[PDB]
From Swiss-Prot, chain C:
Source organism of the structure: Mycobacterium tuberculosis (strain ATCC 25177 / H37Ra)
Function (record text): DNA-dependent RNA polymerase catalyzes the transcription of DNA into RNA using the four ribonucleoside triphosphates as substrates.
Family: Belongs to the RNA polymerase beta chain family.
Gene, per the UniProt record: rpoB
Binding partners and assembly: The RNAP catalytic core consists of 2 alpha, 1 beta, 1 beta' and 1 omega subunit. When a sigma factor is associated with the core the holoenzyme is formed, which can initiate transcription.
Protein name according to UniProt: DNA-directed RNA polymerase subunit beta
RNA sequence: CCAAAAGAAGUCUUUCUUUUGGUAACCAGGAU
DNA sequence: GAGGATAAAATACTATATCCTGGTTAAAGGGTTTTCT
DNA sequence: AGAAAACCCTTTATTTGTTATATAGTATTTTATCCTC
């Protein structure tokens, strides 16, 4: 089962997946800027992976069957890391990030089931 | 029309994010923003910016 | 603000002083001043005095 | 709308009228309706009593078991300290080695004690919060609520947002509240009466 | 309620019929 | 020493005459689409 | 089939953070401290 396989894979890799909210269309841009700032700011031992889940849906717009690549979760990015005082700022200060999405006030980490459900090619 | 459009957009996004399945964090974030949109529609500036 | 945010999201040795500067906010401020203000007014030309 | 939404006229406008109907300070009502804290909307207070005696017994069992495991760990640390002393006295090694090994041992012992105390404190907080759980109680500190709902998911229902306030209004009889307020008016005096 | 086009009658220029076409908020400056 | 009750301060909201005229009404960035070579 | 110049959408994000010329009146929450048991 791909679900079980990815569960096993993501179990070992370090970090906890968090959710970041951006300005709607600033998703690939935010990913690129964050992956560049992770090297420029030397916080590469805390931030490990940035994912923007997408999936392709065929649409017959104007009578034209086209497989356009949509975004599963529009306006959110998935970041695997260990939250600290430096990582939090390095993420929250990326141009195009609206801030972390948390449960009550502080950042909350997704469960492996949810992240597997969206990092699996749809 | 702008204030109604914001409400409609937020409501449609939340409605689509529920049927699609999503964690509780994201759904609650969408609900909070929907709550803030109706507040702006009824009385803009009574709470916040 | 833009310059020092952009100095961290571009790889070094590709940066040139022309790729950090964004002149648009500066010219926007001048337009805002000379078009919208209570001190920038239409000259009074009822008579020379 | 895909979710319930409150009207700002009856929430914000001073005096807050939802905070008079439900007896909630505006400061923490803003927490509830803007997804900044949980609220206990219902609790079972007799099923509690029974399973509460039972779960007090169970919680004591859990605490004692964890404490015993930690005590065994401390005993292993003490055996390590005895081995260190054996190393010290056996061959020739003066103050340096003695002090180093003893500092390491005492540091480890104190760290184990601290871990025990902290875990016991967390479990004590869980128990204390559960025993006194009441409706309209704001559970900040998400992890506390997650632990409570996981351990004792029954005996209480808690929600968040405007749907929680909707459920609070549904489970709200308007006659007992009025009679209580009238009695307090007739007797209380002071700020209680003026409120 | 008005404009344009076409048809009919008379007057030398009106009437009848058909079709088409048909606002606000801000900021500023004055007056009594 | 602890709890309650009363001053204190601190925020929250509300109002401030009538009439007239003149100039403006979004930018900025991302992703995409369509046409041209 | 790839590149360039013109569309369509979003949003003024809201930090472990970019905002200091009113006064006068009332009303409601803190809060701090004092008094009592």
């Amino acid at each position: 089962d791909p679900a079980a396989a990815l569960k096993a894979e993501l179990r070992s890799k370090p970090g906890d997946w968090y959710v970041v909210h951006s300005y709607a269309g600033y998703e690939n841009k935010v990913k690129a800027n964050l992956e560049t700032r992770v090297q420029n700011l030397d916080v590469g031992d805390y931030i490990f992976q940035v994912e923007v889940p997408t999936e392709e849906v065929t649409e017959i717009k104007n009578g034209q069957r086209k497989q356009v690549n949509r975004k599963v979760l529009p306006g959110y990015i998935l970041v695997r890391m260990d939250l600290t005082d430096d990582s939090w700022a390095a993420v929250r200060n990326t141009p195009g990030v609206t801030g972390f999405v948390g449960a009550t006030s502080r950042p909350s980490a997704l469960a492996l089931d949810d992240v597997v459900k969206f990092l699996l090619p749809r | 029309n702008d204030l109604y459009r914001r409400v409609i957009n937020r409501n449609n996004r939340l409605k689509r994010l529920i049927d699609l399945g999503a964690p509780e964090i994201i759904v609650n974030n969408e609900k909070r923003m929907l709550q803030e949109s109706v507040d702006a529609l009824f009385d803009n500036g009574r709470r916040g910016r | 603000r833009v310059v020092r945010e952009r100095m961290t999201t571009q790889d070094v040795e590709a940066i040139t002083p022309q790729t950090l500067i964004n002149i648009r906010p500066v010219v926007a401020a001048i337009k805002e001043f000379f078009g919208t203000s209570q001190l920038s007014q239409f000259m009074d030309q009822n008579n020379p005095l | 709308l895909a979710a319930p939404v409150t009207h700002i006229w009856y929430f914000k406008g001073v005096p807050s009228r939802l905070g008079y109907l439900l007896d909630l300070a505006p400061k923490d009502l803003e927490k509830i309706i803007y997804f900044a804290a949980y609220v206990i909307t219902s609790v079972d207070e007799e099923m509690r009593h029974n399973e509460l005696s039972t779960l007090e017994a169970e919680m004591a069992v859990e605490r004692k078991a964890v404490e015993d495991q930690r005590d065994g760990e401390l005993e292993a640390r003490a055996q390590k300290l005895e081995a260190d002393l054996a190393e010290l006295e056996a061959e020739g090694a003066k103050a340096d080695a003695r002090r180093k090994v003893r500092d390491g041992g005492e540091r480890e012992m104190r760290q184990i004690r601290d871990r025990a105390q902290r875990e016991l404190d967390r479990l004590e907080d869980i128990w204390s919060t559960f025993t006194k759980l009441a409706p309209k109680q704001l559970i900040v500190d998400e992890n506390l609520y997650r632990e409570l709902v996981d351990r004792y998911g029954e005996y209480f229902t808690g929600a968040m947002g405007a749907e929680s306030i909707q459920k609070l209004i549904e489970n709200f009889d308007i006659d007992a509240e009025a009679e209580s307020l009238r009695d307090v008016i007739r007797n209380g005096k002071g700020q209680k009466k003026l409120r």
